[PDB]
Paper text:
However, the microbeam is also routinely used to attain higher multiplicity datasets from larger single crystals. This is typically achieved by collecting datasets from multiple positions on a crystal, or by using helical data collections. In this example, a large (300 µm × 50 µm × 50 µm) cubic insulin crystal was used to collect 3600 frames helically with heavy attenuation, yielding a flux of 1 × 1011 photons s−1 at an oscillation step of 0.1° with 30 ms exposures, in 7/8 multibunch mode with 200 mA ring current. SHELXC/D/E and CRANK2 were used for phasing and density improvement, followed by cycles of manual building in Coot and refinement in REFMAC5. Substructure search was performed in SHELXD with the DSUL 3 keyword specified, using data to 2.5 Å resolution and yielded a substructure solution with a CFOM of 42.2, CC all of 24.75 and CC weak of 17.5 after 4000 cycles. Strong contrast was observed between the two hands in SHELXE, with a final CC of the partial model of 41.5% after two automatic building cycles. Calculation of a model phased anomalous difference map in ANODE revealed peak heights of S positions of 14.9, 14.9, 12.9, 12.9, 12.7 and 12.6 for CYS 19B, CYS 20A, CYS 7A, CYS11A, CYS 7B and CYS 6A, respectively. Experimental electron density is shown in Fig. 6.
Residue numbers in the entry:
A (entry chain AAA): 1 to 21
B (entry chain BBB): 1 to 29
Write the structure that this text describes.
């Protein structure tokens, strides 16, 4: 999930926008 | 601000700034 992708590893804009409504 | 390790309040802040008026879901489990 988001923690594995953006906290344990380096985040991206691409991935953050997958969590916008 | 997005291209880094973001945890906790730092991750929620990035979601808030990117998603704007859409809002977002924060599902750490």
């Amino acid at each position: 999930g988001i923690v594995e992708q953006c906290c344990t590893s380096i985040c991206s804009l691409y991935q953050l926008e997958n969590y916008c409504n | 601000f997005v291209n880094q390790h973001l945890c906790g309040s730092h991750l929620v802040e990035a979601l808030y700034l990117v998603c704007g008026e859409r809002g977002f879901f924060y599902t750490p489990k």
